[PDB]
């Protein structure tokens, strides 16, 4: 014999939405890991305002990514000031992000140079992901405007009560390994720490960046993943992005509640 009890659902995205509402406290505690023995290549200056907005629109489990666009201070070709973050239609897991194949295209970015991408990560990591090496290399192979000596990966790792940023570039050998890689697991054959190196990065308050977002939709498709396609096309607009759990990212929750 036995007794009798009934199941009341406990959906995970609600705990995540509550948690994401508190992301703003991390923006007052952002750290840049400076442990590179010597800088390799350039110095990247990320404006604080877009970094903090990028933190506030993210999720603690599902990675988001944004493309980096910038220029060099007039007399200093070895500094790259990050001037814009582009959010494109995307979805993610805790280990990787899925972006479309098409890179941002817009008149406002035409006098800027692509500097790579930024993405969030649940946990700090001594090494750059092989997912990230593969993503950067496959982008480089599809798009020759991405020079390996100039484009970077900024990871924003969620460390307790805070955020730690670290910025990497690919190496020739890293590019060549990542473009041919098809094992998407945590330990693909061939992966080496000689595939990437750490570039210097600074957080600045003296200038402001801006955002570009899609024109006909938003950027978050983690609740609509079906509608997301690697071959999908999109235009952009000068505007600031909506937070991860904003209503227009999860319309099915609102319509299916009103059902019953």
């Amino acid at each position: 014999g036995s007794m009798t009890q009934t199941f009341s659902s406990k959906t995970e995205w609600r705990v995540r939405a509550i948690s994401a509402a508190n992301l703003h406290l991390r923006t007052n505690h952002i750290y840049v890991s400076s442990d590179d023995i010597k800088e390799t290549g350039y110095t990247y200056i990320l404006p604080k305002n877009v970094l903090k907005k990028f933190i506030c629109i993210s999720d603690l489990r599902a990675q988001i990514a944004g493309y980096l666009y910038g220029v060099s201070p007039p007399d200093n070709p070895q500094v790259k000031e990050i001037r814009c973050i582009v959010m494109v239609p995307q979805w993610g897991t805790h280990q990787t992000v899925h972006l479309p194949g098409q890179l941002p295209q817009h008149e406002y970015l035409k006098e800027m140079e692509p500097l790579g991408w930024i993405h969030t990560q649940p946990n700090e990591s001594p090494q750059l992901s092989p997912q990230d090496v593969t993503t950067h290399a496959k982008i480089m192979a599809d798009n020759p405007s991405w020079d390996g000596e100039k484009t970077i990966i900024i990871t924003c790792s969620f460390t307790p009560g805070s955020c730690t940023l670290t910025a990497y570039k690919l190496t020739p050998s890293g590019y060549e390994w990542g473009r041919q890689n098809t094992d998407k697991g945590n330990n693909p054959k061939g992966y080496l720490p000689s595939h990437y190196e750490r570039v210097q990065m600074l957080l600045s308050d003296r200038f402001l960046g801006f955002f570009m977002v899609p024109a006909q939709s938003s950027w978050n498709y983690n609740f609509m993943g079906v509608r997301h396609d690697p071959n999908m096309k999109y235009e952009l607009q000068l505007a600031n992005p909506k937070e991860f759990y904003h209503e227009v990212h999860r319309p099915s929750h609102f319509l299916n509640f009103a059902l019953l």
Binding site: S9, L208, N240, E247, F254, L255, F257
Partner: protein
């Protein structure tokens, strides 16, 4: 009173509200008896006997009522006994009344009689009603009753043309409701919330009568609302000294005499008590009190009792049963119908074969509900609020026919439908209250109303009310229905909220005010009369007989509560109360004070939707909500599906509130009476609670949270989430379609780009591709574009263009559509700027222009954002990114010129005795600035610029320049332009004393009368003028020598080139430069200005060498300026002024407690209010009368010369005021008292800040916005006025310093810091004002082709500033290509407009030439558009009728204000005027001036405002009339031109063509004109020719008045006219004919025209008109001015030979009846 005590308000509260029973015992009328039954007792009370008529009382027939009030009793014969006892007190007096009568006894007809008395006060002589003169408030407790009352009063009063209406919901778009209505019917709460806001031009100043219906509501938890209303009303009476009549209608209950005291009712005049025997139908009562406690069988007992009682009336009587729910109505109807079926009794209800059974079967088969058809053929029915209007009407019309036997219903029918029934059964007295969170008893008003419905008034000899309740409640209901349940006050709990409302309004500024206010509460009366009931011992009362100490303690306790929750800042020692924005929001949105404390605690800019919904759920309005066990499973079913996650566990009431709101937006239906009721209660409050949150976060600038909370307001209003297809908001669209669409999952926006075909395909149902299309373009949608205009490197001016991009349809858009304009920073985080925008239907197709300032910084941010979002439409917004990538900032302004520490310059440096005689008495030395500029001004002819703050003596510098002129040239001409007429007049006084009195040159002040001004320019050495009086003059410079012979040209306050009237000043300065370059003999220019950042642009524009431009910045002012800017957080203007009231006083004591103070305030009314407020503050302070510095009796010879008594009292306590509506001698007295030191403070209105001959040690600027009535909006003070006000804090001979405090809305604070501590950048706006000057310069032949226009533009300041700040003028570069194209475009557009108007001709698209219209527009200085309208409207057949119409329609006169308070004053005016106008709209300045001109022609004198308005209409009327004369004459039209010529005279003298010439004579009245026209005298020469003694004999006049008559009779024109046709014996057809006329005045020109009723001094003008009267043909005309003797030549063409007999006309423009006529003839060959 210091020994105070803090009370526990909650311990004093009557917990049971209207169910509190203050009486200990209950005596029933004789014959009551008590039946014992099983488990329930019954009490029976027999019907009462009426006393037939009492003692000598008879029924008044309507015929003996006053005649004006009979119409309101149409269809009745005589009033009933109540109305007959009341008609004298109600109709024949204004006495406040209290009528206590049993419900349905006739009280509302007594209210109608009071209303009619009020209405009678406004019947003018035409019989209609000045329905703009009054308002009547009818406060009814329930909404259904409100609606019924609107209907029935509307019908009774429709014969009077009176509007009766209710006030519905949204009132920030719909206050026109109140203007359109004379009788406003509403609930207590609605009128509370409306008068809580106040606002200036609220129509609550017209309230004459307040009717408080069912005033025994005082005993209810809602009663404190009535107490707040009455106390507020009586306080407003005290303050504004207007009287308002108060009328109470009550049930018959104890303490009515206390209620009478509370309404200020005289018990011997206004109190009437009619006991329950005066009920229309006597009432047999049965009370059934059940003892059975256990619920399940108590329920069956109840249904058994009701079945038995209903059986007692089946087939004899209809039975109206009352139940507590919309659901139990059908449930109970069916319960008893089924118990009837079970026992075979339905045959009793409908006797067989009846017409009734057939009628009911037919109507139940035709009309159908669910239960209504399930019941109607039986004789049953139900009625409630979820029922169709037509089905309610069906139930009502069938019951009225006596067809329904058992009708089950709710209280709504009791209140809103006039539907009685012989038997009434109230089945149970319990109801669920969500506010209380539990079951409670029915309120008293409900019970009284329902049992009032017992017994049909004409069909029944008695009613039978049967009340079923719990046994323990019997004594209560027995008391209620038998005159024994006392009316108590429930307000002790609401005291904090009510007190805060009065503090927010400013009615209560401290604890003494609050004590006096509380003494108007009904609580106070009941405390005095029964202290033990309210917690006061009898010995506490004998030691405090007025309850002063007790009221102080209550007010103390409440004020401490409000201060702890931050609604109020309470200074305990002084008792002073300071308002806050949070307090204001609590009051204006009807939020309880604990709730805004929560909102202030939890609201943060980072808040998410999750936390916002939780903040909402924590409102104190929900403090009694609980989570019930039976609710928990359904609440969990919802809490796991909610789209907004809830952090709280389900055990928390806040989680339940959260889930109920979310379910409501999702339109979920729940199971559970409690949960549905609780959801209704939660969401009915959500609207205004969320609107309060939205206001808090918007005024804090919190961009994201503002967006979230405005969205939540709209999601609550519309019952849907953003995600849903916005098309749902078109109720009239089918839902299956929108579901198809939003399922198709594609952006709504793309639907705009398709057509009916493609959308019909995209949704897969093209059947209605057109329909969707319609709605897609009915959805509100705005297009935005921006012009950026850099002011500096850190302040940016934005001009937003809003273009509507949708079809308007008043079925969905109403009459207006509201939006928020939000200007947000780079990160969409801070609202840098926001404003309300209203798109009115009449403007739904026009571009709307908005302009504002936003700060900016370097390095420039990427962009800002401008959002325009609908105030009520979901998913309705346009965002315009404003990128700064291509913005051109102006360069940093250059440093000032250094102030040189020079030896202060002695007056003796003038090296001239006579010259030094002007200053040596006044001071020994010139200040540092004059000392620095002296050598260049006095010893050089260089053009010079002096920039420096107001109060640096720049006028003395221009005086240096004038004196140099007088030494160079013994007869030099100087012209001095200042931009304001009041400045010109001050300068004219001072310079007349200096240069004419002392140096004996001639100083003259231009009047605007061009011939006078030309003679002044000819004879004067100093010509003082405003810009336009110099524009009209100096246009004609090629023909006028005295214009070019000018030695010196001085322009003062030249920074006003940048302000509203800058263009004309820029034009005249540029012209003086051009003229100097033409005549090649230079004209020296001296420019004086406030400190300017772009000073060098002005100096270079005026040709001032850099060494001769002195550009000082504000730090050099000779009297140092301590400027303080305090910001004020309150965004509502009346409350912000309130929060400034006391800081004004504190500023006086801190910065100038001994020394003189000016306070500038935004309006006329405010000057008086603030003088009194300052006085109150210093009285309640220690230092009373501290601002008077002479004695109380040295003043009174000054004082009696005044009329304003308030001005007298304030002046007595040392405080004056100045405003525009004061007589000039009153203002002169206040100025003389102020400057003499007698009074220390003067409060002056904004508009007088240029013509004030006083200065002070301290200037306070109290707020920096004024209300403009034309645009119905608050406008910022121009920076120029603020600089002028600040300049008044400067006393060089008396003070070591000047101090100024500017109090402003906080959002203006930093702006003032940038534009006061730093010099001012000014720009041209001439590009916006081009046409009239271009036209002048084409008339003058200065511009003859487009090249000339481009060149002439290069002389202007606009051309200089187009290079320094290109973006400001909409250039994108500064290359010569750029401005060449820009100037060409400007020129092409201006010339094309002029050519279209037919002012100029353009040929070969290159050569321009003046036309006659343009010549007229330029000559008389008239707007080119006006002269175009004039070319349209005038024909060969106009006369004095058409002319007034045409000239009213002038661009010069559309600036005439239209204030609502004249909309009947003119309506009757338009009736007393001789010319009957055509189709009157009354929101038109052109019609307004038409009627003001017919007023002036008839000599009707009106108010001071309408007089002020006519006095400036008259200053342009003569130009306009002469322009018409010129048009009509050029065409060839004789009759209309002669008519306009006489209209010139008519306007001058203020008479008509029909009126008699003697009306022109001083001191002449109508009786004199009668005794003149009788025998002997018809004209003015008739009076001159009479004998001197017979003159006095007929005149009946003083000798001073006879000298006044003689002055006119000797200035009256008498001219000998001769005429001859030169060579009249040699006239050939088609040949020249020259006629010569000669005019000889008998005694020359003594002086100007005598025209006391015309403002400007005129000089006589004359026309010579040769025409032929038959042909309506004018063949020649000349204009002449006559000085004794003058000859005129008129040449014209002869026609072919025939019969031609001409008339010569000699016509005046000034006097009437001097027009001479000489007919003559010439033989043509």
């Amino acid at each position: 009173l210091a020994p105070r005590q803090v009370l526990d308000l909650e311990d004093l509260v009557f917990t049971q509200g209207s169910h509190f029973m203050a009486n200990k015992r209950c005596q029933l009328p004789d014959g009551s008896f008590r039946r014992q039954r099983k488990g329930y007792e019954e009490v029976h009370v027999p019907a009462l006997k009426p006393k037939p008529f009492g003692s000598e009382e008879q029924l008044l027939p309507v015929e003996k009522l006053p005649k004006y009030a009979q119409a309101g009793f149409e269809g009745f014969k005589t009033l009933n006994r109540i109305q007959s006892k009341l008609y004298r007190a109600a109709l024949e007096t204004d006495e406040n009344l209290l009528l206590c009568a049993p419900t349905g006894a006739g009280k509302t007809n007594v209210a109608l009689m009071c209303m009619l008395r009020e209405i009678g006060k406004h019947i003018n002589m035409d019989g209609t009603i000045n329905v703009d003169d009054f308002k009547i408030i009818y406060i009814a407790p329930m909404r259904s009753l409100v609606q019924e009352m609107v209907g029935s009063f509307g019908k009774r009063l429709a014969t009077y043309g009176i509007t009766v209406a209710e006030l519905t919901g949204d009132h920030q778009l719909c206050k026109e409701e109140i203007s359109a209505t004379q009788i406003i019917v509403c609930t207590p709460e609605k009128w509370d919330i409306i008068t809580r806001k106040g606002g200036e031009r609220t129509y609550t100043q017209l309230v004459r009568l307040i009717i408080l219906d069912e005033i025994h509501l005082l005993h209810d938890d809602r009663g404190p609302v009535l107490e707040a209303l009455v106390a507020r009303a009586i306080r407003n009476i005290e303050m504004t000294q207007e009287d308002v009549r108060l009328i109470g209608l009550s049930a018959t209950l104890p303490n009515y005499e206390d209620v009478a005291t509370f309404l200020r009712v005289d018990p011997a005049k206004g109190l009437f008590y009619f006991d329950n025997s005066f009920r229309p139908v006597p009432l047999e009562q049965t009370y059934v009190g059940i003892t059975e406690k256990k619920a399940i069988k108590r329920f069956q007992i109840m249904n058994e009792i009701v079945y038995e009682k209903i059986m007692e009336h089946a087939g004899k009587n209809q039975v109206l049963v009352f139940v507590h729910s919309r659901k139990e109505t059908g449930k109970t109807a069916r319960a008893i119908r089924d118990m009837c079926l079970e026992k075979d009794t339905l045959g009793l209800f409908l006797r067989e074969g009846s017409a009734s059974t057939e009628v009911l079967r037919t109507e139940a088969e035709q009309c159908k509900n669910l239960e209504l058809k399930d019941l109607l053929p039986y004789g049953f029915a139900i009625h409630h609020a979820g029922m169709t209007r037509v089905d309610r009407t069906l139930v009502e019309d069938l019951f009225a026919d006596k067809h329904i036997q058992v009708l089950v219903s709710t209280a709504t029918l009791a209140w809103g439908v006039n539907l009685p029934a012989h038997t009434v059964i109230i089945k149970g007295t319990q109801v669920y209250s969500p506010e209380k969170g539990r079951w409670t008893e029915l309120g008293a008003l409900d019970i009284l109303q329902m049992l009032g419905r017992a017994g049909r008034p004409q069909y029944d000899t008695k009613g039978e009310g049967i009340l079923i309740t719990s046994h323990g409640e019997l004594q209560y209901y027995l008391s209620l229905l038998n005159q024994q349940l006392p009316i108590e006050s429930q307000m002790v709990s609401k005291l904090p909220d009510m007190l805060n409302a009065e503090i927010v309004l400013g009615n209560v500024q401290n604890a003494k005010d609050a004590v006096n206010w509380l003494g108007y509460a009904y609580l106070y009366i009941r405390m005095l009369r029964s202290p033990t009931l309210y917690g006061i011992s009898h010995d506490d009362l004998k030691g405090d007989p007025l309850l002063d100490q007790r009221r102080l303690d209550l007010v103390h306790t409440a004020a401490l509560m409000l201060d702890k929750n931050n609604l109020v800042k309470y200074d305990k020692k002084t008792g002073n109360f300071q308002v806050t924005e949070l307090g204001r929001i609590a009051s204006h949105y009807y939020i309880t004070n604990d709730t805004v404390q929560t909102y202030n605690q939890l609201l943060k800019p980072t808040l998410s939707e999750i936390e916002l919904f939780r903040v909402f759920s924590l409102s104190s309005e929900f403090k009694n909500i609980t989570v019930r066990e039976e609710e928990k499973l359904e609440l969990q079913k919802l809490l796991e599906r909610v789209p907004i996650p809830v952090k709280e566990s389900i055990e928390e009431p806040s989680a339940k509130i959260n889930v109920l709101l979310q379910a409501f937006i999702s339109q979920l239906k729940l199971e559970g009476f409690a949960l549905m009721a609780d959801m209704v209660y939660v969401t009915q409050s959500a609207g205004r609670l969320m609107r309060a949150i939205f206001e808090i976060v918007l005024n804090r600038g919190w961009a994201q949270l503002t967006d979230k909370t405005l969205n939540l307001c709209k999601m609550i209003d519309k019952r849907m989430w953003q995600s849903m297809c916005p098309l749902r908001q078109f109720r009239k669209l089918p839902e299956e379609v929108v579901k198809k669409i939003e399922k198709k999952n594609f952006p709504f926006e793309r639907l705009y780009d398709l057509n009916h075909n493609e959308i019909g395909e995209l949704i897969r149902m093209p059947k209605m591709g057109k329909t969707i299309h319609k709605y897609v373009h009915l959805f509100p949608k705005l297009e935005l574009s921006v012009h950026l205009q850099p002011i500096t490197r850190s302040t940016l001016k934005v001009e937003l263009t809003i273009t509507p991009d949708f079809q308007w349809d008043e079925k969905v858009h109403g009459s207006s559509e509201a939006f928020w304009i939000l200007v947000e920073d780079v990160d969409s985080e801070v609202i840098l700027h926001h404003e309300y925008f209203l798109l009115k239907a009449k403007y739904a197709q026009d571009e709307h222009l908005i302009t504002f300032f936003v700060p900016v910084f370097e390095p420039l941010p990427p962009q800002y954002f401008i959002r325009v979002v609908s105030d009520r439409w979901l998913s309705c917004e346009t965002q315009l990114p404003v990128s700064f990538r291509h913005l051109i900032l102006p360069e940093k302004y250059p440093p000032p010129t250094e102030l040189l520490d020079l030896q202060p310059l002695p007056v003796s440096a003038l090296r001239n005795s006579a010259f030094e005689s002007l200053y040596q008495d006044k001071f020994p030395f010139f200040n540092p600035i004059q000392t620095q500029v002296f050598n260049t001004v006095y010893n050089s002819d260089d053009n010079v610029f002096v920039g420096a703050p107001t109060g640096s003596g720049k006028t003395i510098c221009a005086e240096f320049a004038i004196l140099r002129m007088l030494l160079q040239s013994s007869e030099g001409r100087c012209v001095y332009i200042t931009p304001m007429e009041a400045l010109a007049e001050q300068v004219y006084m001072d310079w007349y004393e200096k240069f004419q009195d002392r140096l004996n040159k001639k100083v003259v002040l231009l009047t605007g009368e061009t011939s006078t001004d030309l003679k002044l320019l000819g004879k004067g050495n100093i010509i003082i003028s405003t810009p336009e009086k110099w524009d009209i003059l100096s246009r004609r410079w090629k023909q006028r020598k005295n214009v070019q012979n000018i030695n010196l040209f001085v322009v003062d306050e030249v920074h006003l080139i940048g302000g509203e009237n800058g263009p004309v000043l820029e034009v005249i300065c540029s012209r003086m430069r051009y003229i100097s370059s033409q005549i090649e003999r230079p004209i020296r220019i001296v420019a004086l200005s406030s400190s300017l950042s772009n000073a060098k642009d002005v100096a270079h524009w005026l040709g001032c060498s850099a060494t001769s431009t002195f550009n000082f910045h504000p730090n050099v002012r000779p009297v140092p300026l301590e400027l303080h800017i305090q910001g004020f957080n309150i965004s509502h203007t009346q409350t912000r002024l309130l929060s400034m009231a006391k800081p004004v006083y504190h500023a006086i004591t801190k910065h100038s407690p001994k020394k003189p103070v000016i306070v500038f305030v935004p309006s006329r009314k405010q000057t008086r209010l603030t003088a009194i407020d300052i006085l109150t503050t210093c009285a309640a302070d220690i230092q009373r009368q501290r601002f008077l510095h002479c004695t109380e009796k040295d003043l009174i010879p000054y004082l009696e010369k005044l009329s304003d008594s308030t001005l007298k009292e304030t002046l007595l306590n040392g405080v004056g005021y100045l405003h525009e509506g004061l007589s000039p001698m009153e203002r002169r007295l206040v100025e003389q008292l102020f400057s003499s030191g007698a009074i220390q403070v003067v409060v002056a209105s904004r508009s007088l800040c240029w013509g004030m001959n006083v200065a002070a040690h301290l200037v306070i600027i109290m707020d920096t916005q004024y209300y403009n009535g034309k645009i119905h909006a608050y406008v910022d003070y121009p920076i120029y006025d603020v600089l002028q006000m600040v300049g008044h804090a400067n006393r060089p001979l008396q003070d070591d310093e000047g101090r100024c405090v500017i109090m402003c809305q906080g959002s203006k604070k930093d702006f003032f810091k940038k534009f006061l501590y730093e010099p001012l950048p000014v720009e041209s706006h001439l590009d916006h004002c081009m046409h009239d000057h271009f036209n002048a310069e084409i008339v003058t032949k200065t511009i003859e082709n487009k090249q000339d226009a481009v060149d002439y533009l290069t002389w202007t300041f606009l051309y200089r500033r187009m290079t320094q700040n290109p973006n400001y003028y909409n250039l994108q570069g500064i290359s010569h290509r750029h401005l060449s194209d820009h100037l060409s475009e400007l020129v092409e557009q201006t010339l094309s407009d002029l050519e279209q108007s037919k002012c100029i001709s353009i040929e070969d698209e290159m050569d321009v030439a003046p036309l006659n219209l343009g010549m007229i527009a330029a000559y008389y200085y008239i707007n080119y558009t006006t002269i175009e309208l004039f070319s349209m409207s005038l024909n060969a057949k106009t006369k004095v009728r058409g002319l007034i119409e045409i000239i009213s329609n002038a661009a010069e006169y559309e600036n005439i204000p239209i204030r609502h308070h004249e909309d009947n004053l003119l309506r009757q005016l338009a009736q007393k005027v001789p010319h009957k106008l055509n189709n009157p709209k009354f929101n038109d300045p052109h019609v307004k001036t038409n009627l003001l001109l017919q007023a002036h022609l008839s000599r009707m004198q009106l108010s001071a405002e309408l007089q002020s308005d006519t006095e400036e209409i008259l200053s342009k009327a003569i130009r306009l009339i002469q322009a018409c004369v010129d048009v009509l004459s050029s065409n060839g039209w004789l009759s209309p031109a002669l008519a306009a010529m006489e209209l010139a005279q008519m306007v001058t003298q203020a008479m008509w063509s029909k009126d008699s010439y003697l009306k022109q004579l001083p001191h002449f009245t109508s009786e004199h004109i009668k005794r003149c026209t009788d025998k002997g005298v018809e004209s003015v020469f008739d009076i001159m020719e009479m004998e001197d003694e017979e003159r006095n004999a007929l005149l009946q006049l003083t000798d001073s008045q006879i000298a006044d008559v003689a002055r006119f009779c000797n200035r009256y024109p008498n001219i000998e006219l001769s005429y001859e046709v030169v060579d009249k014996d040699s006239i050939r057809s088609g040949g020249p004919v020259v006629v010569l006329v000669q005019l000889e005045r008998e005694e020359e020109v003594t002086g100007p025209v005598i025209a006391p009723l015309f403002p400007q001094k005129r000089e006589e003008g004359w026309w010579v008109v040769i025409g032929d009267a038959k042909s309506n043909s004018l063949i020649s005309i000349k204009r002449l001015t006559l000085q004794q003797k003058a000859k005129v030549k008129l040449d014209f063409v002869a026609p072919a030979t025939g019969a031609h007999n001409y008339t010569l006309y000699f016509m005046s423009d000034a006097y009437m009846g001097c027009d001479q006529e000489y007919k003559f003839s010439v033989d043509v060959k």
